[PDB]
Amino acid sequence: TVPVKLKPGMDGPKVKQWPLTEEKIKALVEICTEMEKEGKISKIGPENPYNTPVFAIKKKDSTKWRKLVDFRELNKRTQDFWPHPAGLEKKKSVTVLDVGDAYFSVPLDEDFRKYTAFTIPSINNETPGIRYQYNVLPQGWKGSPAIFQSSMTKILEPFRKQNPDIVIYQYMDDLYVGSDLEIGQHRTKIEELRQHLLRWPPFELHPDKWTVQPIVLPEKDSWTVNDIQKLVGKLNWASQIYPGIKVRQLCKLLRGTKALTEVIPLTEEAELELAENREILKEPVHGVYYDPSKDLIAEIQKQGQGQWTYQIYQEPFKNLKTGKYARTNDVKQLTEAVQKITTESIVIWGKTPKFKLPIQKETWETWWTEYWQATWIPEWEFVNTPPLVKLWYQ
Amino acid sequence: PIETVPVKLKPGMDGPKVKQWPLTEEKIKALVEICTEMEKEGKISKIGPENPYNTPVFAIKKKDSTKWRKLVDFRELNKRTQDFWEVQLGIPHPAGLEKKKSVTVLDVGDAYFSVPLDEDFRKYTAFTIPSINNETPGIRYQYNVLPQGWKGSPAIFQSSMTKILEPFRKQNPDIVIYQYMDDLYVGSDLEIGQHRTKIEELRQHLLRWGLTTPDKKHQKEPPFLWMGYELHPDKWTVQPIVLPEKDSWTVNDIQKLVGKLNWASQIYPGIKVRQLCKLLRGTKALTEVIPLTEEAELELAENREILKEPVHGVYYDPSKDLIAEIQKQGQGQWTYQIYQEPFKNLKTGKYARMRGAHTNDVKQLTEAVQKITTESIVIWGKTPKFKLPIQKETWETWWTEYWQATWIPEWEFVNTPPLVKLWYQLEKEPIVGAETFYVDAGYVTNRGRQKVVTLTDTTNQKTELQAIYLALQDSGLEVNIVTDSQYALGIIQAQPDQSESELVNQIIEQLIKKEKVYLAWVP
Numbered sequence A: 001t002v003p004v005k006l007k008p009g010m011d012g013p014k015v016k017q018w019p020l021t022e023e024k025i026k027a028l029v030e031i032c033t034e035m036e037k038e039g040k041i042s043k044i045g046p047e048n049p050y051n052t053p054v055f056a057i058k059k060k061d062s063t064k065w066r067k068l069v070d071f072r073e074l075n076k077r078t079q080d081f082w083p084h085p086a087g088l089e090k091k092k093s094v095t096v097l098d099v100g101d102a103y104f105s106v107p108l109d110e111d112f113r114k115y116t117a118f119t120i121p122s123i124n125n126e127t128p129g130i131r132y133q134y135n136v137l138p139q140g141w142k143g144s145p146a147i148f149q150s151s152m153t154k155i156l157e158p159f160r161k162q163n164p165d166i167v168i169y170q171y172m173d174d175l176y177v178g179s180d181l182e183i184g185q186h187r188t189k190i191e192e193l194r195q196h197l198l199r200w201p202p203f204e205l206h207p208d209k210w211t212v213q214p215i216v217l218p219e220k221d222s223w224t225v226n227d228i229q230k231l232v233g234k235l236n237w238a239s240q241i242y243p244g245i246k247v248r249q250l251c252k253l254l255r256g257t258k259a260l261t262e263v264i265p266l267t268e269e270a271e272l273e274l275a276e277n278r279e280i281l282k283e284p285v286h287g288v289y290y291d292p293s294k295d296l297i298a299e300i301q302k303q304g305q306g307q308w309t310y311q312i313y314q315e316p317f318k319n320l321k322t323g324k325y326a327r328t329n330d331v332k333q334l335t336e337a338v339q340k341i342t343t344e345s346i347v348i349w350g351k352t353p354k355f356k357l358p359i360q361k362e363t364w365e366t367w368w369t370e371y372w373q374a375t376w377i378p379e380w381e382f383v384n385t386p387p388l389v390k391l392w393y394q
Numbered sequence B: 001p002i003e004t005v006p007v008k009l010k011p012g013m014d015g016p017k018v019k020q021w022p023l024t025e026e027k028i029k030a031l032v033e034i035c036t037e038m039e040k041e042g043k044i045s046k047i048g049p050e051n052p053y054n055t056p057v058f059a060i061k062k063k064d065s066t067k068w069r070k071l072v073d074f075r076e077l078n079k080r081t082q083d084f085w086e087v088q089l090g091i092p093h094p095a096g097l098e099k100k101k102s103v104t105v106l107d108v109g110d111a112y113f114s115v116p117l118d119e120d121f122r123k124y125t126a127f128t129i130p131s132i133n134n135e136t137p138g139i140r141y142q143y144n145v146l147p148q149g150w151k152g153s154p155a156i157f158q159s160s161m162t163k164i165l166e167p168f169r170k171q172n173p174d175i176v177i178y179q180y181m182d183d184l185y186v187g188s189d190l191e192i193g194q195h196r197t198k199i200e201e202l203r204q205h206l207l208r209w210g211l212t213t214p215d216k217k218h219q220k221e222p223p224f225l226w227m228g229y230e231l232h233p234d235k236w237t238v239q240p241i242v243l244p245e246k247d248s249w250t251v252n253d254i255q256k257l258v259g260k261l262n263w264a265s266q267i268y269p270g271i272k273v274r275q276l277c278k279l280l281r282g283t284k285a286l287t288e289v290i291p292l293t294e295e296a297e298l299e300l301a302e303n304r305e306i307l308k309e310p311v312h313g314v315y316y317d318p319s320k321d322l323i324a325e326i327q328k329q330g331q332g333q334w335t336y337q338i339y340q341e342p343f344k345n346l347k348t349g350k351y352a353r354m355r356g357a358h359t360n361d362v363k364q365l366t367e368a369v370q371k372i373t374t375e376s377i378v379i380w381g382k383t384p385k386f387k388l389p390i391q392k393e394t395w396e397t398w399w400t401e402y403w404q405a406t407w408i409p410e411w412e413f414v415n416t417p418p419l420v421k422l423w424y425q426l427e428k429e430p431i432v433g434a435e436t437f438y439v440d441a442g443y444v445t446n447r448g449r450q451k452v453v454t455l456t457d458t459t460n461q462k463t464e465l466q467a468i469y470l471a472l473q474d475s476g477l478e479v480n481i482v483t484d485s486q487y488a489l490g491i492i493q494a495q496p497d498q499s500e501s502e503l504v505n506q507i508i509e510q511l512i513k514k515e516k517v518y519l520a521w522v523p
């Protein structure tokens, strides 16, 4: 085992466990009861004051439950360990594989196990609740992938030299296998992997198509005072980014106090300005690169009608990406989107971003696990998106 | 014997070294008696002059007796001792229990004093008993079992108990046991005699570990009063609440009454404190007497009546679905009931939480639904099917116009006034032929009209809503309003129906009147 430690000075996590449904609890019991039999985990005693919340999510294309342990706090308190494929996103199509079970065959430094304590609560606090800690490398922990790195190269060695046509990237419990081969000749080399892996794992992304939704301006037959006003307001907001945007000429049609619905013919001078403003918006602003030293932020907006919008930046307005997601219920969608964005974020930069979700914390904390499927959990906070902003997207 | 839990002092820190304060020869004797007995029984052990650690101890007299009782002040040791797994924070709610035929409660005497202490820690539990002779040194002991007053006792005791109960619970899956501090509640559906018999089995099983308990003649009988409730094996309620009968009320009395009234609302529907609570406005002292307004008197009277006849909560029948029903019982006031059997409440309640300065009934209702949902998962580990006074059409509409996401489990409309609705809606497109008002403390319209007024005791954004307000007043049934206030925009766009701000309310009032209103924003 490897002597792991928390970042200097730091102690272990003591995260409250969000109440669970009788269903999820029963599942977690059947599971932990079993991991206990196989020595992966062990019941702990009162001398352990640490805690990490545990949840149960269902696997996609599987009737079985998966134990999702939210080691977010613990991962922050863990020490750092001392390479992302510049072309994984370039690749035509990538598949994602869960190799979390790889860890369940490697011990966890004895003096560190205390820090992985977690609890299976009981309905209405009628019983004290089952307490365990890990003996093997736990799925979801920052240290597992790291500590298992060696053993992982020693195993991806053959496929890597055998098939140097496919790029393989690992991220925590997941494996991103990319290539440009035919989708049939792909889904194959993938199963050829699931086999070279069983020799020691359940589940296409196509990072090729991932596009940056530009800002758009209404193309109207006729233009009313209102239309122009929405136009100017939006443009003005965007002049913050693309300073070449002018509205001087558009504001001229808006002098006086006309009737909102009054149709306005657009002056020659003005129609030539809009076109320039349109051209400028066709592509993302220049000189905005990804700083590895900065957190990735991801904001979402409910557009309505089952349509959402996101943007990934580090500095305000300086967007690294922008997208849109479309169809359930509001919550299901938002969770599916978060994941979709997290994956992409991983695929492109190798780090999950920090989301700013438009929903009450209690509502989210309540249903998010009903549709979550990823093995990781991004960081997130809850916000109250303004109107104007939402209007300026999609 | 039970397993020993490994204790350690907090990092870096060292054991306590508190000098023993002086003790009357009288107390000295009594202690030497108490401690000599403890050393005979193995709970403590005479130690050597090598141990530097010390904890102060003193004697206390127990009601009824010439005898004294020993008390050890483990504060410092407590400060220097590690943190343990939080002794049960959450308690069950009567409504989550399933009825039993018989329920027996048992007190565990010799609680801590019957559980081993980690050998490496015993050296910190050192205390000294001063001798009466001046030349003679007083005796020093240490603990061998969990000490009363020590930090890790509550948790390590429960830990042990749970382990001790393991087998018995397995051999008896038909018996339910809830552990609470030194008490133990045991229910079963066995026949009277069989139940009493099992109790005796448990009693002996626990005693096999030195844990003593009361025999049938000495056990407390139902209903058991617990955490403010009055529990039967078949039904539950809050313990009898009596309402003061007087003509002089202080702020203290009113606050206590309101507090008492809230407690009851979880079983007694119809309880209201809106008027009593009002009596609290501007109060200067806790002893200030506030006359009961005519409405507060009427309120107290209805609650008093509601509380005259007891009502009981039935227990959870896991075979049946949970049904939840919400009612709007006044502006910002809601009431809900949770039952399985048509109208036999497992529990009730009232939500009055306004999240944010402005809001509408839909938001509020929805938040009430979320609050209830969370509550149920906690008590019954499942969410109830809801009965709501809102129509799907209405809800759905507001849903898709709102920028925030939200969900509502299975729910059916219940035509039970008042039905929640939206009192108004902003046109999606500007109104043709409807005058256009441009506001910026005044306004100007395309039809030539205008008006300007000055305002005092006004905040910046307050004047902003004023403009919009004036415009609504002066406009006709249909009106287009243009503003540069992102602030006012949001507020109104949110389509609130209630607010703290009077101004907002008037605006809402205006808004409800109009046929068509279109609001626009401009930088």
Ligand SMILES: Cc1ccnc2c1NC(=O)c1cccnc1N2C1CC1
Residues within 6 Å of the ligand: A126, B092, B097, B098, B099, B100, B103, B176, B177, B178, B185, B186, B187, B188, B224, B226, B231, B232, B233, B234
């Ligand atoms: C205080 C408490 C907490 C949790 N459950 C119970 C109790 N007490 C009871 O009196 C009770 C009453 C009816 C059914 N179960 C009950 N019991 C269960 C143990 C039989």
Ligand SMILES: [Mg+2]
Residues within 6 Å of the ligand: B438, B439, B440
């Ligand atoms: Mg203006």
